[PDB]
Amino acid sequence: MKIEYFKNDKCSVCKAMLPKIQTIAKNFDIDIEVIDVIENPSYPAQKLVFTVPTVIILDKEFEIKRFARNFSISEVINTIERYLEISNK
Secondary structure, three states, X not given: OEEXXXXXXXOHHHHHHHHHHHHHHXXXXXXXXXXXXXXXXXXXXXXXXXXXXXXXXXXOOEEEEEEEXXXXXXXXXXXXXXXXXXXXX
16 A cells, blocks of 8 residues: 655645654555655646645555545544455455
8 A cells, every 4th residue: 555645845734744744654564655846736637636645555556545625634544444454354
């Protein structure tokens, strides 16, 4: 699996959420890529990411769930847990 976290350094919700999402990734031993949409806009533009923060959970480069606009960090944890529960069964 993989977490992709899209941010910019002028986004205050992004700064506050970044250590949480990093801890979540460490907690589940999932790779996490932090992507700055201003510094490196090519891949975000290809993925159709326009707002930050945006969180994409992936497995084998397949998009399991995208979070943008209105979401809490608990929704991200819940999706990761449900996906691992389904996968491990």
